[PDB]
Amino acid sequence: MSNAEAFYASIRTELESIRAAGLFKNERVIATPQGARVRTTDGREVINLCANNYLGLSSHPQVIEAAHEALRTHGFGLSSVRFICGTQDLHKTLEARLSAFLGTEDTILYGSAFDANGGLFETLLGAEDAVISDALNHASIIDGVRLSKARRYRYQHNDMDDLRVQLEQARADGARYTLVFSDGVFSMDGTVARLDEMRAICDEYGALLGIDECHATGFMGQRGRGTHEARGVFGKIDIITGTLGAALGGASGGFTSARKEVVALLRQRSRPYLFSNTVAPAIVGASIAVLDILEASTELRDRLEGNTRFFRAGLDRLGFDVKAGDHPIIPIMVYDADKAQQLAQRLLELGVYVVGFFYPVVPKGQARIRVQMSALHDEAALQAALDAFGQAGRELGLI
Amino acid sequence: MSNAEAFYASIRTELESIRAAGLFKNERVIATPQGARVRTTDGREVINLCANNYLGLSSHPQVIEAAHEALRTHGFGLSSVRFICGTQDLHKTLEARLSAFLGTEDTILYGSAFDANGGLFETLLGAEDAVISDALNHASIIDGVRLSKARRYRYQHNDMDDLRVQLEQARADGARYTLVFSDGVFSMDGTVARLDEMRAICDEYGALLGIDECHATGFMGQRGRGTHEARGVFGKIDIITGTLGAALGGASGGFTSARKEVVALLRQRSRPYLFSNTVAPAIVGASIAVLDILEASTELRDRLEGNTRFFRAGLDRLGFDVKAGDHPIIPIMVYDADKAQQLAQRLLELGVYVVGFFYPVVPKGQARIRVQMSALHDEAALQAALDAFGQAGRELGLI
Numbered sequence: 001m002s003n004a005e006a007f008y009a010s011i012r013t014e015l016e017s018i019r020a021a022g023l024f025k026n027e028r029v030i031a032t033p034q035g036a037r038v039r040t041t042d043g044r045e046v047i048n049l050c051a052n053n054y055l056g057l058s059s060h061p062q063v064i065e066a067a068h069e070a071l072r073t074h075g076f077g078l079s080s081v082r083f084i085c086g087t088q089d090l091h092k093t094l095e096a097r098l099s100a101f102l103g104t105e106d107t108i109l110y111g112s113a114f115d116a117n118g119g120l121f122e123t124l125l126g127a128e129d130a131v132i133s134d135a136l137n138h139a140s141i142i143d144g145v146r147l148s149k150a151r152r153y154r155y156q157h158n159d160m161d162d163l164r165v166q167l168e169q170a171r172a173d174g175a176r177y178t179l180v181f182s183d184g185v186f187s188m189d190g191t192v193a194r195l196d197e198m199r200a201i202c203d204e205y206g207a208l209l210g211i212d213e214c215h216a217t218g219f220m221g222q223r224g225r226g227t228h229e230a231r232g233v234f235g236k237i238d239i240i241t242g243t244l245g246a247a248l249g250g251a252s253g254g255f256t257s258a259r260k261e262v263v264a265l266l267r268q269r270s271r272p273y274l275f276s277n278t279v280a281p282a283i284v285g286a287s288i289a290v291l292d293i294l295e296a297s298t299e300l301r302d303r304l305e306g307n308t309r310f311f312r313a314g315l316d317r318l319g320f321d322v323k324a325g326d327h328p329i330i331p332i333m334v335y336d337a338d339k340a341q342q343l344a345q346r347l348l349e350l351g352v353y354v355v356g357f358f359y360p361v362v363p364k365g366q367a368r369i370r371v372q373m374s375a376l377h378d379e380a381a382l383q384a385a386l387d388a389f390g391q392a393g394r395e396l397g398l399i
Numbered sequence: 400m401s402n403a404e405a406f407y408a409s410i411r412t413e414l415e416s417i418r419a420a421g422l423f424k425n426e427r428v429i430a431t432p433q434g435a436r437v438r439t440t441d442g443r444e445v446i447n448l449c450a451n452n453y454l455g456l457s458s459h460p461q462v463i464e465a466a467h468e469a470l471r472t473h474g475f476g477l478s479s480v481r482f483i484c485g486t487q488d489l490h491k492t493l494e495a496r497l498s499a500f501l502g503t504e505d506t507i508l509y510g511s512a513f514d515a516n517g518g519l520f521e522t523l524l525g526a527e528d529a530v531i532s533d534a535l536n537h538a539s540i541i542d543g544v545r546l547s548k549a550r551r552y553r554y555q556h557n558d559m560d561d562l563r564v565q566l567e568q569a570r571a572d573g574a575r576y577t578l579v580f581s582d583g584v585f586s587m588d589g590t591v592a593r594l595d596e597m598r599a600i601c602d603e604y605g606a607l608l609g610i611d612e613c614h615a616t617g618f619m620g621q622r623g624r625g626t627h628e629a630r631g632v633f634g635k636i637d638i639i640t641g642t643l644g645a646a647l648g649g650a651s652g653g654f655t656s657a658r659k660e661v662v663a664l665l666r667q668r669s670r671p672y673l674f675s676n677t678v679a680p681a682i683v684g685a686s687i688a689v690l691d692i693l694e695a696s697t698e699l700r701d702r703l704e705g706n707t708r709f710f711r712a713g714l715d716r717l718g719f720d721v722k723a724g725d726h727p728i729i730p731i732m733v734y735d736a737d738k739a740q741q742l743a744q745r746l747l748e749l750g751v752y753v754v755g756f757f758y759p760v761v762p763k764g765q766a767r768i769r770v771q772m773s774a775l776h777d778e779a780a781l782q783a784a785l786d787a788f789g790q791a792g793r794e795l796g797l798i
């Protein structure tokens with residue numbers, strides 16, 4: 001045996017254990033645009049309830065037309081990081097619209113939220129500083145922290161008391177600056193961070209407050225500005241990282257929004273911004289259209305909140321356990337991974353499209369279906385999906 | 400004075416000393432599509448010699464039209480990671496076409512090359528393994544390796560004897576599996592990895608060979624297939640990472656190409672792939688067309704080769720320390736950061752667009768201009784370019 005081929009056997013062994021544990025993930029091949037209804041390459045039309053397309057913007061024809069126009073005026077790719085020849089007028093324009101929307105001085109675009117998190121902490125913090133994370137923070141945040149030299153603290157999920165004991169330890173350990181950082185809305189359970197309480201704890205210790213708004217920007221708060229708007233601390237957030245790939249168009253791209261001098265150091269020093277391609281023109285141009293849509297009317301935001309309130313009461317009525325609260329992320333816990341796989345594949349036979357979350361996406365013993373509400377769902381699709389959730393939801397033992 | 404405001408003052412202090420050191424980067428706002436000539440918002444139209452638009456596909460009309468049709472048929476955003484509702488028939492087709500193009504059994508798409516490298520090493524290698532890296536490996540590779548638990552060795556730049564020293568040491572230190580990793584073509588100096596020696600050196604020790612092919616894919620090799628074709632190792636590479644935002648369209652996306660079991664484990668566990676948005680339907684669609692163009696004829700990469708040799712031989716006979724060759728990346732060393740901004744500025748006034756390179760993009764005191772060739776350039780621009788370099792080179796003590 002050569003070491004190389006041996007390595008391929010340990011890879012094949014790992015792939016077979018993952019199957020055996022029922023933890024293997026099967027891709028489904030959609031053949032149409034992203035939509036509240038969608039058809040896979042088998043011709044079966046189904047109702048999509050597991051997309052980050054909260055506002056219906058991923059195939060919105062005005063967003064589509066803005067991409068078409070931005071291709072005619074601004075080309076297909078730039079093939080350059082921002083500082084060489086990758087900055088068009090669109091990137092500056094969008095950065096100003098994002099900053100105004102989010103309530104901040106400035107904004108720096110990234111290829112993804114993953115990279116915005118990836119290049120945030122290492123640029124702003126050093127070995128003498130501390131970051132204190134909610135224990136449920138998105139993987140991209142964990143990896144951004146791991147790439148920094150800062151001292152690390154984690155506090156129990158949404159546990160404000162634990163947040164206080166960590167800031168005490170952090171101060172006891174002699175932290176210089178301290179950044180408290182959390183998902184604005186948590187990906188896997190839909191809970192909303194208590195930014196109002198966390199603003200207060202932070203001011204008391206003198207710590208910065210950052211949030212990751214991938215599941216909030218565009219539809220949280222009455223004006224859809226985000227978790228910080230929904231919790232009364234709009235204009236009082238040190239650092240907003242977020243995505244363009246969810247409620248604001250769903251194509252690609254991300255951002256960090258902060259004061260002008262934080263953003264300025266990120267342009268000078270943040271490794272995904274120096275060493276990774278700029279956002280494509282068509283994506284930036286459509287993103288500007290998305291901010292016009294949302295600053296002219298809260299109709300999509302409001303319609304989304306209605307579909308969630310309808311569909312959450314609906315799942316409550318059937319004896320399903322309504323995790324979290326107002327949010328469009330409805331996590332239907334099943335704990336066992338195999339049941340999650342069964343329920344998802346049985347809902348596909350009943351014409352509903354959701355998928356199973358299990359390790360490593362969610363902790364072991366905590367598998368689930370994440371149902372996601374879009375503003376685009378019609379009553380027929382929703383009342384139909386409730387039936388399909390009812391049948392399978394009894395036909396497999398969930399109640 | 401509160402802790403938060405002191406942090407912000409620290410950031411402002413840091414910005415200032417970046418300006419004083421001659422290291423502050425200023426973006427140019429381009430009002431036009433990417434191309435051989437470009438116009439900033441000040442109306443000036445200049446010759447672009449600093450893009451990754453190596454093949455001119457960034458604004459190629461058939462590429463722009465394929466993005467249009469992809470918008471029509473497959474929408475604008477998918478707003479999902481791949482394992483949920485983020486997989487369309489396009490992603491599958493392109494993963495196959497790339498595997499065929501690169502010599503591999505399968506491909507996995509990422510949002511960028513930065514994230515392809517980000518999620519490689521941590522998914523394949525453990526604390527008991529090793530990674531041997533060329534000292535000048537790309538920042539994204541260093542960051543991928545940092546995120547894994549593998550032991551890290553470093554060999555001197557392109558030094559085949561030192562590569563053998565690390566391989567010996569790693570075995571002596573008891574490494575289980577070993578992966579030797581390198582830029583195919585190196586970002587800041589244009590040198591080509593000696594893949595042919597490395598594949599033989601790696602074979603003695605049963606090590607894996609992995610290569611980053613951003614500055615290669617599309618135009619290196621006879622049929623433009625990469626640094627591995629140009630070294631006659633095509634079909635014999637364990638891992639290829641690479642981008643679509645350089646020669647292959649310039650918009651977004653990346654990939655890792657490997658034996659079907661590597662790719663399958665990356666799908667199961669690679670953190671960027673599970674946890675970050677899928678590539679946008681327009682980019683995959685235009686990417687499939689780019690491979691249509693490049694697999695139909697070698698003309699574009701063939702005239703990139705001509706533009707490179709003409710321009711390399713030109714700067715040589717002008718007095719520039721520029722070797723004759725066909726490395727589309729032509730480094731112009733300047734060492735001083737201030738002298739690099741001045742050379743870029745003076746070349747701008749003379750009708751040529753290039754940008755200074757300085758710390759942390761290159762080592763302190765090793766500042767440069769990175770001329771970058773493209774298949775787009777006609778001889779009248781190539782010639783007018785040379786004239787700009789002869790003069791500003793004369794004016795600044797460079798020749």
Ligand SMILES: Cc1ncc(COP(=O)(O)O)c(CN[C@H](C(=O)O)[C@H](C)O)c1O
Pocket residue numbers: 080081274275276277278451511512513514537539582584586611612613614641642643644652653
């Ligand atoms: C070898 C290598 N790998 C990976 C990446 C990341 O590529 P992507 O844009 O995320 O797809 C780059 C980006 N190279 C830049 C550039 O040379 O212009 C940077 C200034 O080094 C690269 O050179």
Ligand SMILES: Cc1ncc(COP(=O)(O)O)c(CN[C@H](C(=O)O)[C@H](C)O)c1O
Pocket residue numbers: 052112113114115138140183187212213214215242243244245253254479480673674675676677
């Ligand atoms: C809080 C947070 N930050 C960052 C990201 C990555 O953002 P981007 O796609 O790289 O722009 C996500 C993606 N959430 C995904 C999803 O929930 O479907 C994933 C399965 O966790 C997120 O929830």
